[PDB]
Design a protein around this ligand. Sequence first.
Ligand code: SF4
Ligand code: SF4
Lengths: 534, 532
Amino acid sequence: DFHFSAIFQPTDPHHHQTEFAKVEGSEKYVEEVEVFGRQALKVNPEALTILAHRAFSDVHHFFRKDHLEGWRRAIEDPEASDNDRYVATTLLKNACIAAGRVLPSCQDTGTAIVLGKRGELCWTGGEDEKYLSKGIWNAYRYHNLRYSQTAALDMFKECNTGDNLPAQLDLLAVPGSDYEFLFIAKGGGSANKAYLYQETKALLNPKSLRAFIEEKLKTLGTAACPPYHIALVIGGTSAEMTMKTVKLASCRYYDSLPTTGDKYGRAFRDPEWEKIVMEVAQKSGIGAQFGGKYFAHQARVIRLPRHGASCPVGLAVSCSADRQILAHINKSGIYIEQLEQNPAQYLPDITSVKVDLKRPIDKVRQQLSQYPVGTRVMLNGTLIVARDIAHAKIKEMMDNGEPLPEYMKTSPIYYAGPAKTPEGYASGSFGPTTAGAMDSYVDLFQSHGGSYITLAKGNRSKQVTDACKKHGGFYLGSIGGPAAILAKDSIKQVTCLAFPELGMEAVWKIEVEDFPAFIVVDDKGNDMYSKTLA
Amino acid sequence: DFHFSAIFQPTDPHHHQTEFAKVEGSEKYVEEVEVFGRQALKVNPEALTILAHRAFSDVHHFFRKDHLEGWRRAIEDPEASDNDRYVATTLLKNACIAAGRVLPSCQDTGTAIVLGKRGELCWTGGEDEKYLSKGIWNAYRYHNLRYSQTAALDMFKECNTGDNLPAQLDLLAVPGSDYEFLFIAKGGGSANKAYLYQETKALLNPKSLRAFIEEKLKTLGTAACPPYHIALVIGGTSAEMTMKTVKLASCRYYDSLPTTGDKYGRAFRDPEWEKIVMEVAQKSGIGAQFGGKYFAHQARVIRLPRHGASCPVGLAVSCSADRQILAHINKSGIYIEQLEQNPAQYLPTSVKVDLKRPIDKVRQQLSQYPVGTRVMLNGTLIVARDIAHAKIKEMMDNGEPLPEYMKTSPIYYAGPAKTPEGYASGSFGPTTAGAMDSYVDLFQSHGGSYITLAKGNRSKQVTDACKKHGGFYLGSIGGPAAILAKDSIKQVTCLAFPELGMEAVWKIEVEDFPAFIVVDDKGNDMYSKTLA
Ligand code: SF4
Ligand code: SF4
């Protein structure tokens, strides 16, 4: 009566539907042997370093076809809004710059995540973690990427690790003698939009599930740079299993799962509810960051078994920096997924207010006050750059009696942290970070005569709308994601002004030209997300 | 220069601090060999079946010392409340029954979770998941446990798998030639109290973190049968990594981590903030289920590295059914963590309520007492939980009446384990009340469910409903499923929806069933002060 049924039963477990390229000459790293009648593969661990290094270089300059097709859909769909088409065109042009292999597609070159599946008879010598980490170290050290990892010296004392390590290394034991991989360069912003809900059987009916989806999609907002790949996982054997599944779903790792359940509790993809998620996303009006139809590229919905007393639910997105690469090592060598090297083919063959920042900031506020939310502006002049740690350090100084520093009162505040500057370039990739993380500082800083104008991406909380109304302030929404084209075209000079020890989180002073943004919050209580994200 | 630093650097990675017993004769399943100059281990995969079978049998009848010591601490502390001591005494007596190896310690014998670490040169033949699952299948089939897994035939159509499969099988590739395991029989109630929060740098200061902890501990409530092992994980490289870490922390799997961080971002345990969590737990007044000091056995706090833009936070508990077992296979055979087989060494009025009356008479009697009154129920209970409530609401939405069996007796939210041969009942404690909250006002406005019996604090809608309709919520002690079955339950019959397995509607006859009045018919809630 016993019948074993694996939870996950992909019809394409080795991802034959994906195109792979062989690393030239890499068969020298493997040797086929036979022990106790069984075929085994000896793998020189240097192969892991070579593979991880190439994966975490290529993935910052190229995208999958299904990602690029989504941007083209947003440009060509008559139902797309004008802002949809503008955002998608910007992101596609950004991808063309990134394909030059100098600037990464986003300034947040992400956390390095490795899912590895080492066969029982795949013999590496056992030091997989170190050799994979050395390849990741190589990719971020010798390329124009960013060191994004923050070490805790104690509970509250932090420092940047200076090399984007440690990585997340999830190495699984599986049958056979090969070594299979999914590499993910996961941005912090989309990582923040991985949510776990503890629900019940009361959710598991069409009316409740639909209302649930409508409610939760709005909590994603625009804070992870849509158009999104939206993943939704209903059920699971534990919270961590549910969240791992929703991560992999967002990477389209589970696309070949069956589409029906059975009495053994196997996982399945649900196309009907994927369509419902897409319908909710499109009808939400949230759009590709600034109102419209293209909140989502596509949806993945996976139904999992559950303990009778439990119903964990996971919701997560892949952002505009959609970065994953499949790979495998076998008797023929090292193979790595082929990404699209000519994104320009997705660009079709076929209006804003000039804002001079080189003025007293009160004159800039006066000009911005003339326009409603949703107005597109082009910024020209100085920005002062500061994000999470710089804001916390400055509040700490003020809590100790010190004044808000003068450099927080002279120019708009750009929430951003740059990637490393290529030789001969004025700036590395340098797009905005998520605005919501700074929300608790705006009222305090504005009441002390600074931060009247902020520039970042993502919808913000009500306290920021109230502060801007109380203090005559503005929040400007940059397009989220196009860090390479912003660096190449808009950022003319970068200098470090304060807190050099914070690395990418230092206070910078930059000079920009033709920097596009939308007025998201004005000085009158208006918010261009108040209807779609209410 | 490059320097590799693993995130987790336990000083005791092989859990040498744990006592293991060897399965007799199990060296016949392993053979040490040498291939290409390296030591390797051939493992007959039948060893995986034998090990998983014994692990998921033993774990339902015995506990670890640190769990039992916590219960004794609650009984002996002069600062514990009377309710603290009463709950802890009940749970220890429950453990004494479970050590008889017939009744499991809880009716919720849990999801079977296996964390496995197979060495590079540990050769099993590769079919580990099937052989581990067969051993799990054996344990739940051939013992008096429960089939708790719900399969989705489509998005909404469900059925019980009938064997407590599938298991969660997380098999990792590690150095060496051994096979190391953590087995977890994870209750659904404590699995539900695994929470993920997406926070920011603004949290990372003493004042903000302390207020955060005080706020989130209350959201645990009593719904997962405290005293809790409380785990808190600050940071992490992803949500799933944070949630995996907090699960393992709650199993005391990371107790030997370093206690200081470094510039490479290694994980560390934080004893100072563990003490703060325990201080918050004690001063909360929530207590061991019914007010007092013993909300928590102990705390684990792990600080993790984070992306500059991110701060995932994980909070999770291990419940009264604290069930995990370490194990390993090596060249000498199969070794399994030794649990405490003599829990008795740790062991140092109420209102009689007759249920054999019209339910309006029972309601009248209950109305004479304030919340916090301990009652003893004698008579018939109707048993129904999540799926039965959903089916009954569906019937009413289609014009059908609220069934008669929802109007004659108190509703006990519960699902039993299998009945041992010659016993009146298998383990049969309550399930979490909160999952039924959305039904109470509806059922009461249709003339039933005036008295409910379960465990855990409930939402305000239930308090409003009981006040509007003259209802009551009675709180059973949560966890003591074996002693309730042995001493209180005299007859069990399946009443409706037999295809639901343990989630069928049952009719049971009980004697001396202990409970507290948690919500009365006047708007009062005995958790309104501690869980506000
Ligand atoms: S800035 Fe936007 S595109 Fe870049 S990693 Fe963050 S969420 Fe993704
Ligand atoms: S009923 Fe209580 S003790 Fe039993 S598994 Fe659920 S939470 Fe744990």
